[PDB]
Homo-oligomer: A and B are copies of this chain.
Amino acid sequence: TRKNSFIYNISKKFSAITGTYSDATKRTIFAHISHSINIIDTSIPVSLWT
């Protein structure tokens, strides 16, 4: 809400991302993920981000 204060960043809620790239399907197949996402984030409407 303020230009140079606290920010809510969905990227900072991840701590470890591991996986394997697939050459055949040209995708990353993710294995273990360490994160702090909770139910409120899944419940945010897309309109409220913008």
List residues of A whose CB falls within 8 A of some B CB. 5-6, 18, 20, 22, 24-25, 29, 31
The distance in angstroms between the C-alpha atoms of A20 and B5, with both chains bound, is 34
Q: Contact check, A29 vs B31: say whether CB atoms are below 8 A apart.
A: yes
Residue from the list B18, B25, B29 in contact with A25, Cβ < 8 A: B18
Nearest B residue to A24, CB-CB: B18
Instruction: Point out the residues of chain B lying under 8 angstroms from A25, CB to CB.
Output: 18
User: Secondary structure at chain A's binding surface: helix, strand, loop or mixed?
Assistant: strand
Nearest-CB distance from A48 to chain B (Å)?
Answer: 22
Q: Which residue of B lies closest to A29 (CB)?
A: B31
The CA of A24 and the CA of B28, in the complex, are separated in Å by 14
